[PDB]
Design a protein around this ligand. Structure first.
Ligand SMILES: Nc1ncnc2c1ncn2[C@@H]1O[C@H](COP(=O)(O)OP(=O)(O)O)[C@@H](O)[C@H]1O
Lengths: 291, 97, 322, 290, 330, 48, 49, 319
């Protein structure tokens, strides 16, 4: 993945948490946070480090339950028969039906779906488990014990990462629709980027720009937004604090707009990244043309 | 559904038998509206069959049901029995009523 | 000139030759007395068959044009080329008003529905796609063929579309529900061309094949399928049985169609000949040495007694009928 | 824009603006409802062609790698994993999303992936549109006079900018001293003399604008009233969900009261016509809305 | 505001004020349908119309074909109860936006006022609201306009008086429904369907009695036949309460008698305490219509026989809501 | 002649089991699907 | 991506479609049927053994 | 047909870097070919005015080009002392033909489609074989530079014009100058013959009397630098009418496809359409800002193409 990432304290803590579960058998993640916060990118980065193969279902408008089952069949075959480390990352927007959760609920807890493989595909799966068990040196013949080995392999190999937005009612609804999601999955509350996280991203990204003013006068009443801002702040630190305040202004803007009854669009950390990126380009362009 | 109601109507139109549909409001609201089109075509055929100028020696009166021409017997009639006091029952559309 | 019995004659009327590449197909304008032909030089030249005078060229396609067709009103021309594109032409203005993409390989057929509000096409990606005239959106795809689909043609009412593919099978589809009504496979080799039976020929077909009159009154749609095994077969779509097999072409049959009066069958092949068939007696009357090379297609005017045949020798010919 | 924009325009005027800007770049219009959307998407990505996709309310999740720029750089090419095949992402590719529903809701992931661009109707813009419309209907000579002068001022101001840029351009590229080469003096004299009449042409155009403006001051209250009526129209949705009215509905009312007004058959006085139009504007609006 | 109380002029608006691209959304409150008006409008315009009832998968197919055929042939298309498929309505609006139909093409979407109707469809088309007429005078005008002039002016000259009496009875009965506990016991579905059946009943028995004669005696009119049929089949069918039936019987006997032809007959007694409504002395349709148009603007529940204080609480509540609506949209 | 050309794609890992599967594939097409197949193979493809 | 492949003495009989250049035109310009995948040849591709 | 060029132009093709020397129409295809002095032969689609390809096999300036009856082969002559034959299917030089010393001026293919003629400064005309490339016979008798040479419609009679003020008609079988015409005031530059569509129109337009056979006899036309266009009778050798009015030297002349009007180009920077029947149409049309070099008339399509010194080739509608 050729996408730049700005690292702060929370990212280091988060990736360590993800790495911990991936090294555990039957390790499943439940990442909760605002969209665009890096939940998928962090999981993919950690999955590469641990050798996991990232799998995401390519959902579209015509996607249906059979398409989901086919994708599940492919993942289980690779995870169980081929003994391939798979990190199955799925977003809640990929759940287009309650049947999607029903298959996942059984898979998360039991590690296998009783109704997924039938008929010819069951025979094909049973055959694939035969030479599959041969490579580890296990001599298993009958179908019943072959399924146990396949189930055991999936539990050890397959890891599931589930990411969804922090919806209070959706959390309660999902607490009953998928009980295994709250029992077989480790819940990590990424949430929105904190004030410190926003400050760290701004400090790192705007480091390339000059933002230096030796004759900058510190006002008596500093509009302090970042709590740990240095008491005699520099010109650069004041700029980054203003950048954090701008992002928080939109959050209050939506709350006031939603309270009155208007339509609001959620503000995400990706908006902050666009803000600093526009700041970097405009500063470079205006400085160049003025010179 | 629409197909079954049309097929039943075709049997009633050809035979010339009275159709009593009790609990008529148990159908889906959307499908009650769809049925109304067939009833209107059937009723229109019956009305045009009753004019004095019509003669039995001419072509028999037919109505458009299920994309087919079905002869309509004058003795046939449609009756629906309903209990509107039950909550959850579908509300018949105004054009059907 | 019997108004439903004229047949072409060896003396050609006009020999139009302006194409730089082999002529793919030739069609007649339903209303105007003008002719449209598509060739492999990515050009669609328009000719007048009364005076044999070239009028204009409709360019815009990047690669060879494979099929052209007209709607009922004659105001729109639908052309498909090998560049994976389908172009809709405003015939009065002679400009491309809409270009349609979506096929994954060579497109070898195109046709406008009798209603004139939808376009059907077949390509080399083993799919038959349907498009909207107004919006240009793909609304349906007909899958099931195992090989390159060469031709697709709708029936008179537009409810059924037939297709012939390299899988040596002819499939009849239902437009409303996309289901395969029948799989007509009796040709021993790839099937090239298909054609439906006009309304004036059902009685003649029924009495010629000896089929008993049905209680419903409709004998059922009849389909013709010329293939490369030098045979022409007439099918009953309702029953799926090959009513007859026509033999006598010396090479691959490229086109086949009925006489407008529903009395004879006109078919052109790669044997450099155009043959007129009597399905009453299952035999051929007249063989015309149409061109000096392969004959790619033919068309029969609905009212006027004129026959046009395209060919690989880059020549389009008009035949008087007497 | 950094993230690919999403355009909201109920009237659709922003749609052809995107077309006109990228017409030279052979921009292609498609929609999410088209079954062949994938083929157009791959063609745009491979050949770097601008693409405009309508009906975003049926958003295909296949754009998620594209909107997120989950690109792979290897061997000098840029690879994007669209579905299950890899496509060389040309740097010239750009995609625009458009919709005609201002009240459509979007999932938060889609909101993060796009840059919302809302084309809303403002009071100032509506007043100008109505003022221009009544001017054309009542004083066509003034309306065409204003239209020509706006074109004149635009290419006068553009000419001055070019002359100012060229004057700095010439002075910065002299290899030595100005008087060393006589041709330099010729250019500056031509450039300086060129701005002489253009400045006078601007001045003579400006005074006519004063006359054009001072005759359009009479129709200013009508345009102000039109803005108030239309925004009352839009706010009618607060009391009932059925009172949904678009801008085109108000324009039709404005068009009807201007050209299809039976009370303007024999009236020729401008003040009398304006009063009649204003009185009937309220009557026509109430009759249609109620 | 004098235009609104007049009956809607669909002929002028559809022909001129409605573009072919704009669908004609015709919303109606429960108990009212706009389908009948368009069919009458199409019949008098001699324009073919295709009516399709939405609610079935094949119903959508016919709708697509009818719309596709009409936009080229310039015909008319009706789709009733489109509110039952809100998802399909969104697709329909998108198709309509990219369309260049014939100049004479018109699309009518008959639906009831439902919150599930897509917002974009409402903005795309023109909305017409069908509801009970505001007053008795308005209810008369709608009744007289709907009934063809030739239908009223038949061989018997007493037919016009009978139609006017039926119109007054229909106006009084329907108007009383705004007072649910007092005017009746529940919101009965007294609509145009009942009025049409009553009109056909009047025609059938008048023709049966008067054998084409120009004039008939007032007592020879089958008053009992009209009174019993209206109280048992036409209007009394929807009545399930004994006291409501008694109230309906009282109105019928107070109106449909031989005394109704008297010059001094009274429609209502002491509407304002001094004045009372008087039977018009006309014998033709025009005279009755002119009297209707001459009715005073002021109206009280005493016109219906209800006490004058029955509308005090209702008017006060509506006034408060009007203030709230103004204060919500400032 | 309409024959469908079938060629085995051999490689370094091509063993007897791979050849048997290819034989099963061509026989199924040419025996059950009534498909005429012209099986073309070279002596180099005969590894065993 | 010009490619150099060493150890030709262990030649893989999978370059035979590449070596024989039995590509076809139309439907994507040059099309090479590498095994079962309809690969689209790049005109700048070249291989050395 | 009354096809007439109009002052409005359709396309002004400018791709040549050197002055254009001649322009021709493809017999069957919608192809217009122009030859210039940069040793390149460019191919254009006159219907849409799009440059198609170039044929850069020649060494020095290309002088004259010609097609065949079938439009399959293109013959070219240039100042590099050679005749080049082009295969129009693939657009390659398939046979380079040497000899015929010094700058070769004109080249043509007889309707037989088997032999080629050429003219050069060496005061002689050579006849070649397209199949082999060997000059079987050579025409001698011109005492100066032979400028422009055309055959007949059946490959039997050939006329050649030269700087020596003589227009000599030659015979394939006898190789003798059947008719020698030495009457022009100044140098003759361009010649063209008469199609069968115009033989009848000459009889009553000049008062010529039919012979015993009744056939009016082969007809000749010669354009010269003396600003005079004169049409000649091959059978007899006397004048019938002289066309005067060109301001400068004439460079190209040919007959209308309908055989009713006269179209010509001259160094007067204008194209003149003249009527010989009644001297009614004297339309003068400004064609190029510089000298106009050559022109051609499409056999069936209502299009005319003109080449000039200004590196620009123009196409005019016919109405
Ligand atoms: N730490 C970070 N620094 C910079 N950009 C980031 C960071 N985390 C996420 N992003 C941006 O977010 C995008 C991917 O978001 P994604 O992880 O898919 O959202 P979600 O977490 O909702 O799945 C990338 O394009 C990247 O630019």
């Amino acid at each position: 993945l050729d996408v730049p990432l700005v690292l702060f304290n929370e990212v280091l803590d988060h990736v360590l948490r993800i790495d911990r579960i991936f090294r555990q058998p039957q390790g499943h993640l439940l990442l909760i946070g605002v969209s665009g916060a890096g939940k998928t990118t962090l999981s993919r980065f950690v999955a590469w480090m641990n050798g996991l193969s990232v799998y995401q279902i390519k959902v579209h408008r015509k996607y249906t339950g059979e398409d989901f089952d086919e994708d599940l069949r492919t993942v289980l075959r690779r995870s169980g028969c081929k003994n391939e480390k798979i990190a199955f990352i799925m977003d809640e927007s990929n759940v287009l039906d309650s049947g999607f959760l029903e298959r996942m609920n059984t898979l998360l807890a039991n590690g296998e779906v009783p109704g997924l493989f039938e008929g010819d595909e069951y025979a094909t799966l049973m055959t694939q488990c035969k030479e599959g068990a041969q490579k580890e040196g296990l001599m298993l013949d009958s179908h019943e014990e072959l399924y146990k080995w396949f189930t055991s392999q999936v539990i050890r190999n397959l890891h599931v990462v589930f990411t969804m937005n922090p919806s209070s009612e959706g959390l309660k609804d999902r607490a009953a629709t998928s009980p295994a999601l709250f029992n077989r999955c480790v819940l990590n509350w990424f949430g929105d980027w904190s004030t410190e996280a926003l400050y760290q991203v701004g400090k790192e990204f705007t480091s390339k720009m000059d933002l230096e003013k030796p004759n900058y006068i510190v006002p008596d009443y500093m509009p302090v937004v970042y709590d740990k801002l240095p008491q005699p702040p520099s010109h650069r630190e004041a700029i980054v604090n203003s950048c954090v305040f701008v992002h928080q202004t939109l959050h209050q803007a939506n709350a006031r707009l939603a309270k009155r009854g208007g339509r609001t669009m959620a503000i995400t950390p990706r908006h902050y990244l666009d803000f600093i990126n526009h700041y970097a380009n405009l500063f470079h362009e205006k400085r160049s043309e003025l010179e | 559904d629409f197909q079954a109601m049309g097929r039943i109507f075709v049997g009633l139109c050809q035979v010339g038998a009275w159709g009593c549909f009790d609990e008529f409001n148990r159908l889906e609201e959307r499908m009650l509206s769809a049925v109304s089109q067939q009833v209107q075509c059937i009723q229109e055929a019956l009305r045009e069959h009753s004019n004095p100028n019509y003669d039995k020696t001419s072509a028999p009166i037919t109505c458009e049901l299920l994309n087919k021409q079905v002869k309509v017997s004058p003795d046939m009639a449609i009756f629906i029995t309903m209990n509107p006091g039950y909550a959850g029952r579908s509300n018949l559309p105004d054009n059907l009523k | 000139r019997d108004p439903k019995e004229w047949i072409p004659r060896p003396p050609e009327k006009y020999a139009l030759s302006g194409h730089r590449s082999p002529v793919t197909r030739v069609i007649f304008h339903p209303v105007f007395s003008v002719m449209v032909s598509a060739s492999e030089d990515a050009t669609i030249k328009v000719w007048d068959y009364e005076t044999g005078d070239f009028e204009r060229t409709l360019k815009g396609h990047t690669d060879s044009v494979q099929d052209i067709s007209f709607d009922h009103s004659g105001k729109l021309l639908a052309s498909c080329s090998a560049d994976m594109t389908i172009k809709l032409w405003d015939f009065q203005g002679f400009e491309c008003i809409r270009t349609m993409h979506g096929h994954d390989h060579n497109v070898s057929s195109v046709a406008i529905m009798p209603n004139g509000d939808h376009i059907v096409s077949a390509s080399r990606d083993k799919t038959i796609k349907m498009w909207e005239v107004q919006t240009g959106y793909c609304v349906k795809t007909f899958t099931g063929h195992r090989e390159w689909v060469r031709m697709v043609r709708p029936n008179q009412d537009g409810t059924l579309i037939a297709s012939c593919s390299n899988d040596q099978t002819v499939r009849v589809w239902v437009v409303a529900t996309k289901e395969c009504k029948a799989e007509l496979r009796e040709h021993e080799h790839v099937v090239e061309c298909i054609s439906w039976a006009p309304e004036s020929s059902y009685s003649s077909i029924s009495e010629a094949t000896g089929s008993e009159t049905k209680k419903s009154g409709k004998p059922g749609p009849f389909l013709l399928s010329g293939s490369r095994d030098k045979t022409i077969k007439m099918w009953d779509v309702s029953t799926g049985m090959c009513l007859m097999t026509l033999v006598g072409h010396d090479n691959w049959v490229r086109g086949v169609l009925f006489h407008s009066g529903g009395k004879f069958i006109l078919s052109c092949a790669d044997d450099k000949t155009l043959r007129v068939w009597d399905y009453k007696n299952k035999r051929c009357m007249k063989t015309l040495n149409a061109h000096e090379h392969f004959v790619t297609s033919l068309d029969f005017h609905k009212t006027a007694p004129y026959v046009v045949t395209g060919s690989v020798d880059q020549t389009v010919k008009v035949w008087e009928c007497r | 824009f950094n993230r690919y924009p999403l355009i909201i325009d109920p009237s659709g005027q922003a749609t052809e603006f995107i077309m006109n800007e990228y017409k030279d770049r052979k921009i292609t219009r498609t929609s999410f409802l088209d079954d062949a959307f994938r083929k157009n998407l791959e063609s745009a990505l491979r050949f770097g062609n601008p693409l405009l996709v309508q009906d975003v309310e049926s958003y295909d999740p296949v754009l998620n790698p594209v909107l997120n720029r989950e690109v792979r750089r290897t061997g000098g090419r840029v690879l994007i994993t669209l579905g299950d095949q890899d496509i060389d992402l040309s740097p010239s590719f750009v995609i625009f999303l458009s919709t005609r529903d201002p009240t459509v809701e979007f999932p938060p992931d889609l909101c993060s992936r796009v840059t919302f661009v809302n084309f809303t109707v403002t009071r100032s813009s509506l007043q100008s549109q109505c003022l221009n419309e009544v001017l054309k209907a009542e004083r066509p000579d003034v309306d065409e006079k204003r239209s020509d002068l706006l074109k004149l001022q635009g290419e006068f101001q553009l000419r001055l900018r070019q002359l100012e840029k060229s004057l700095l351009q010439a002075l910065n590229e002299v290899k030595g001293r100005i008087l060393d080469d006589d041709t330099i003096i010729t250019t500056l004299e031509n450039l300086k003399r060129e701005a002489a009449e253009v400045t006078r042409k601007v001045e003579e155009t400006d005074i006519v604008m004063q006359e054009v403006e001072t005759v359009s001051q009479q129709y200013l209250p009508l345009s102000t009233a039109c803005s108030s009526i239309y925004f009352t129209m839009e706010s009618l949705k607060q009391i009932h969900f059925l009172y949904q009215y678009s801008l085109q509905f108000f324009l039709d009312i404005y068009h009807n009261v201007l050209y299809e007004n039976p009370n303007l058959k024999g009236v020729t006085d401008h003040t009398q016509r304006l009063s009649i139009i204003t009185k009937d504007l309220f009557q026509v609006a109430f009759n249609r809305v109620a | 505001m004098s235009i609104m109380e007049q009956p809607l002029d669909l002929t002028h608006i559809v022909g001129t004020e409605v573009k072919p691209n704009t669908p004609v959304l015709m919303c109606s409150v429960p108990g009212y349908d706009a389908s009948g008006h368009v069919e009458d409008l199409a019949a008098e315009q001699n324009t073919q119309i295709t009516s399709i009832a939405i609610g079935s998968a094949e119903g959508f197919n016919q709708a697509d074909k009818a719309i596709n055929t009409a936009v080229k042939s310039g015909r008319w298309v009706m789709l009733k109860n489109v509110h039952l498929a809100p998802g399909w309505l969104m697709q329909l609006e998108k198709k309509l936006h990219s369309l260049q139909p014939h100049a004479c093409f018109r699309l009518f979407l008959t639906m009831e006022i439902n919150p599930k109707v897509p917002v974009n469809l409402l903005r795309a088309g023109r909305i017409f609201v069908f509801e009970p007429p505001p007053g008795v005078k308005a209810n008369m005008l709608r009744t007289f306009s709907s009934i063809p002039v030739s239908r009223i002016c038949k061989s018997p000259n007493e037919r016009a008086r009978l139609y006017f009496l039926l119109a007054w009875f229909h106006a009084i009965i329907q108007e009383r429904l705004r007072y649910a506990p007092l005017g009746w016991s529940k919101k009965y579905e007294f609509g145009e369907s009942d009025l049409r059946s009553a009109c056909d009943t009047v025609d059938t028995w008048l023709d049966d009695t008067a054998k084409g004669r120009q004039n008939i005696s007032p007592d020879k009119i089958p008053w009992s036949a009209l009174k019993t049929l209206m109280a048992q089949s036409i209007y009394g069918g929807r009545v399930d309460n004994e006291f409501d039936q008694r109230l309906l019987n009282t109105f019928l006997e107070r109106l449909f008698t031989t005394r109704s032809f008297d010059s001094e007959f009274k429609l209502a007694c002491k509407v304002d305490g001094h004045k009372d409504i008087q039977m018009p002395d006309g014998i033709r349709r025009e005279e009755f219509v002119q009297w209707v148009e001459l009715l005073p603007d002021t109206q009280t529940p005493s016109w219906l026989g209800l006490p004058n204080n029955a509308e005090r609480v209702l008017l006060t509540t509506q006034g408060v809501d009007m203030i709230s609506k103004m204060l919500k949209m400032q």
